[PDB]
Symmetry: T
Subunit: 136 residues, 12 copies
Amino acid sequence: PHFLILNGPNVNRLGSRGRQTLTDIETDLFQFAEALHIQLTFFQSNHEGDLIDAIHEAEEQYSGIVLNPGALSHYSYAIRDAVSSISLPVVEVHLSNLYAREEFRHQSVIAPVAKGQIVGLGAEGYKLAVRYLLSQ
Amino acid sequence: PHFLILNGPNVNRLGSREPEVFGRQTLTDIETDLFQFAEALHIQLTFFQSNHEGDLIDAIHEAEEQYSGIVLNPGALSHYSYAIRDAVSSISLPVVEVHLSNLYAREEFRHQSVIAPVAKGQIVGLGAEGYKLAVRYLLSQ
Amino acid sequence: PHFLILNGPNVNRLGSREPEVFGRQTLTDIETDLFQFAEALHIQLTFFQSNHEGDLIDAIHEAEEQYSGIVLNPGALSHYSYAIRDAVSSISLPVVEVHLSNLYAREEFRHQSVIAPVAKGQIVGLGAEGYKLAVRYLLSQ
Amino acid sequence: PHFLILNGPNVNRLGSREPEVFGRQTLTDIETDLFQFAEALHIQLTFFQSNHEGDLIDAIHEAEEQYSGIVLNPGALSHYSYAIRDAVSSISLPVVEVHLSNLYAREEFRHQSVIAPVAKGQIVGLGAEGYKLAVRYLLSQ
Amino acid sequence: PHFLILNGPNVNRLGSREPEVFGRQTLTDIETDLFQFAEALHIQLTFFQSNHEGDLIDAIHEAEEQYSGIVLNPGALSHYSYAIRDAVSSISLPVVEVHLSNLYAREEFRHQSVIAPVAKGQIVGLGAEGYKLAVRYLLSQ
Amino acid sequence: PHFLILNGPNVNRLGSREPEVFGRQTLTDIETDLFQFAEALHIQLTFFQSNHEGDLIDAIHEAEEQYSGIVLNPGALSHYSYAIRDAVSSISLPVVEVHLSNLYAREEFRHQSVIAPVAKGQIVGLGAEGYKLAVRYLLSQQG
Amino acid sequence: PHFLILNGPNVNRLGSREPEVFGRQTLTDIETDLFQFAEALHIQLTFFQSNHEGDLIDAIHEAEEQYSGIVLNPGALSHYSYAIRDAVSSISLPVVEVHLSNLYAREEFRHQSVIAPVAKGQIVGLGAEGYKLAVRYLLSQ
Amino acid sequence: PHFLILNGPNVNRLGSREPEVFGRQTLTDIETDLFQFAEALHIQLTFFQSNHEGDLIDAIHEAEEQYSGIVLNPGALSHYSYAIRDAVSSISLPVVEVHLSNLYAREEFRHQSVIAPVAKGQIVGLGAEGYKLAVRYLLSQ
Amino acid sequence: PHFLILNGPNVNRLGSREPEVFGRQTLTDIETDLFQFAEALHIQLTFFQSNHEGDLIDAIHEAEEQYSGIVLNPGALSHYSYAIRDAVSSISLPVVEVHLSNLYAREEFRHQSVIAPVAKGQIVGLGAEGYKLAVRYLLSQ
Amino acid sequence: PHFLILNGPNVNRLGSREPEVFGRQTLTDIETDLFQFAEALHIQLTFFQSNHEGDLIDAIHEAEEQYSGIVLNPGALSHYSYAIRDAVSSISLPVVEVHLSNLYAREEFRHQSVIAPVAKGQIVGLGAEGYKLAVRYLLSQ
Amino acid sequence: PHFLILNGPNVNRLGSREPEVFGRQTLTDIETDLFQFAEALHIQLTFFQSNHEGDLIDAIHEAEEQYSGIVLNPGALSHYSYAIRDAVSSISLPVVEVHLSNLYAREEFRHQSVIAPVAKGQIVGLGAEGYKLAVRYLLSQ
Amino acid sequence: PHFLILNGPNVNRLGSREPEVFGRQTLTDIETDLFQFAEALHIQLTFFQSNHEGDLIDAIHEAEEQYSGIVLNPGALSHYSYAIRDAVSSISLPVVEVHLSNLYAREEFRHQSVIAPVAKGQIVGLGAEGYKLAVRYLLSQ
């Protein structure tokens, strides 16, 4: 199948701050996807509205979304409501272990309405969420 | 007069689920009804919807030179956009905040509006009729 | 139809102060306007005011057999009377909670209603016009 | 490599009640499905479940000399067992906490783990498949 | 050197709400004065204002290859935009947050910045002079 | 002995709705069953309901000279009436607070009673049988 | 002048208990002392007590046309009755809140008054003498 | 019928302090009375006490095939053991939580039960009689 | 009788600014009035002011051997000085806390006293007359 | 005198990591240094360590008939075990809570003990010496 | 102009530890720099540092008749001294509050100033340069 | 060696109150015992007591050049004095905080030390013995 890999603000900057860049990760997932016969489309934006637009338009084109919303996780109730308004399965992903970082990162306002969440397992977390989605 | 009906994120999705809460209607069906309403009431209305906080802010700013009032349904932005709050405060027009479902019966984070303090007032829970009620208030002012 | 306009503690004191907050109108003034409002709508209204939480409760209970809806301005009891909350929940009629002033611009304790979660909805900040808007909603039901 | 699948209180009851939140199987079913995967990759798994906090602590401490990683589903002990947390910190193996239902969609007390800050990570809401995904992560490690 | 003066939502409305015979000071006014200030320290400044959070983020990322420092007045996004916080942390330039009014004397929600922890520092309440003072600090680095 | 069964606001509406949460019966229904238990056990009960906090406070104050114990179902007043709290403290009779539904399973504001600290105890969630249970504790205590 | 001494719920019970906390006199003993106290200053007092919040509200409203000030001991209604707060704000007379026992040494819930912000002031902990001290303050205004 | 009387940590110590809060009687004393009361009303009871959370959880799980109801006095585990809570939720039998002393008059941490939300009900403050009352409720179901 | 009137930080500034909340008399004026007052009730008073916490504490300790009661206005130290609290608890004399303005109508941090729990009582909002009232109370003691 | 040195979960893991925060003696090292000490003063020590909450509770209860005091290092159960709190309260022996590292410098959850309010006292941050210091205190009783 | 640079507790210990947080310089070094910078804008500065809260308050009160502005670095007194806040309110001179390190990146208790609401503004995190900037602001006014 | 015994506000009043909590002894009694104890180990001590925060801070700063350790009993300043906290962090000598009564059994405000996080550790509840225990700990540094 075909899934959308949706990345939020600052995800593009992986690296100046794993050791991987966003581009490195996408190449590996493209490589990861061809091997298992599944299509992926990637999209990244720093704009909360661009992610909400893509979630609403996803419904007619993909069968699942893997979402890494960046720090929008912690406060965007508008992306939370976009996820609840669509019928596809969504999996929230974060590469670093949020629970070991600042306190404002320890709650996601998006996870309650998603299928679930993966935290702390690095870029592998995107492949694991792609595998979960295959099982739906 | 002419008023702006400004709708924020996910308001365009009315109708894809849980109608008991939000109604059977779409945004387009409401828009059509507000247009009969508008023309029987013999007044003008412009509609605008956007999923971007900044688009609503730009519209509030620009409204000052074109409309005499705003009926704002910001979607979930109501609970955290202090930037839309400051936009409403920087203009001279009367703004009425409107939500269709009864927010007070839903999740606790929806129980507080960061925009309402600086608006004229708020109407929550009265369905799509709330837009009409807000337009009446504005006419009345 | 015939609706009950139920007013709580201190609502009878409207007019004596801060017209920029509450209007210059007395309760009597508003009652006269709403009866005028009502006849133009081919409807009936009954008005009742009390400073006693128990009176409000007693009237809510009794309303079920005589009216088809209630517009309730409970005054400051909005913030803490779980008893009036439970009364609203125990009857089948639609109840709209109304407040004239913009509560959200005032003291913090006034920013939450314990009655609203079980009512149809709430109108805040639209002055005495909010009684009329509430009656229009109830008609649309 | 040899991994320990450690299950806490009540995890053995997966069955008793509601499939919609937990899936339809039993803990025994899940264990069966997890051993076919591991024998192909030349990976051994040992399973252990207990309702007692101390048994999990004892197992974690003993793991260090026998396994190369743990998959831990502590049950509700996740939300208050600082003693299991301090156990995880005192061993050098990588530990992945897993829960099958979407905790975030359930009671408030289930929204925080005192164990996750010191673990490699956590997987929540992805059903019994979470155990497998955690094992694959451990292999990427 | 060359610095970015980045202004967020509503900062373009400075002056609105003031009559005009005394006018206040507009953002335009401020930029003219800063262009002269800079001219006198022989430095370059570029100005950018937007009501969209994403456009400030985009500018902070792109800043790195063109400026040696940023003076940021994010308006109300100061109190809640963790995404701007994280943009600031992902670049190596020095950033100074600035606010004209004394936020400590205004609403409680304005008393915290989620961006200041990761910036160099912050200036609050010193009016439009703050932008000059921040430029001076940046030149001393 | 003779006990006072004191019921607060909205307690008269039992039956209005949801038997699952409250039980099928009305307050009249419950009063009848309590009377048959009483005569049988050779005891007297007097029932009073009101929607007015002040009337419950008047009754508590006057109870002292007429009853040997009170079973109190204050309704939602349990969660905020410090005035009814101070009334129970100012009398010498044992009081037992009773609610029919399981409050702990309902809205969060219903999870605390401001009256219970100063009462003998509280019984929550055992439906209408809780009134009887309370009468038994009071009988066991020797008015 | 003529003042009202307004006593709230349970104040009529001064005596059934705890004399180190509330002295041993009864409300009748205190009224007699204020009675002679007043003869001697050539002033009139009227006393009224009630266990009903609505009765205190009614009395406050009616006070305006008959007294020149009010000494209020609301009993525990001090800690939650926003309705009595708003009643005090609706009249022009000076009101002083009075409590016999030292509330600040008792339960936490007793440490805040919701009525005091809108009153002239408050006296707590000075026993029955506080009623005389409030009458003296009122006399000096 | 046959019911389990399940006692948590420290309940075995009823008696080496404060008869004025808990009783004067020992746990053995109470078991004897209950056994006799059981006989009078023709029901069987089994008693089990343990200081280990895990043992109560194991007993609860096993109760389902042997008893028709449980009377549970978990001691201080009431205030923080979500593991026991989840155990009670995973079984079909009616559970009644019971505490001898009036917890609401004691330390604040004792004023909430994490178990009671999922049990049938809770009895607090009625001494050892509460056990009998809980047994009578259970016969009623 | 001989009493100590102890004033804390900023009480010496009564007058430089805003008379609306606390009056237009200075500390000197008030002390002259009180001197006049003592003479008239035939009692002695000693006045002391200081801006140092430590000075107040030293005074309170030394008071015990020279005065029969203390009227303390600690200024803003009321809200946070647990060390003055403990000084008051360490002496046997009756202490009355006094504040001229109605703190409850001001900023939130001024709404709690950490000293009043251990004092005989407190007087708030009755202006400079509150010192006299506290002296009268003390005589009564 | 015969004292019980009771140690909780994860205290057996001492010296497996961080000799700065934790110091470097294994728990065996510490035991060995405490016994030589007791060989005069002419006291006996009995050591017991367990990772089960119930085992500590069982030891506290049985201590009463065999020891004259307890030195308790409960590990992380200090922060949440009200069951062990209640165990300490149900015995007559003096108990001293001891922790080696400076908890106040670590995670916030470690900053409160639910056991200490009912114990004789607490020692934190003095390393392994804290066990000896406790034993001294006990001797002086 | 003649300005008071007022330093509070521990500010005299700049250097004796961290320059990585605070800056390499001692307070003496900073004073020498500001004296020169003062000589170049032809302005006068007086320096004063004390570890006693009352010494700062005494200084703020006396400043009114001698200086035209104060630059205040209160050290840790920022986060709790309401007595200093009230000292700043009582004078007419402009006060600017300055801290060298970026408080917002340090402990949480340091993220609020109780003095800032009533001063002209605050500068935080720009090191010893902050003193110069505050002086500039003062002059710019 | 040579250690400083620094006592804070009210510690000089030991012996004016409740002999259970505070013991029989006065501070002079305790000083004599400690002097007597130090001599029998051959260590010197210097004692200092003050009711002023700044005098403690001054003593901490000056201690660095004269003593090798500090035993500090800050009185109630333990609970809010962030200035004394920063003073302890600004010196290199080991500091032990000591309190005689069991603070955890007293008012809630006494349950947290702001000094403790930056000290070596703390001793609470062990009466006057605590000072001796702290002096022994210091001998190992």
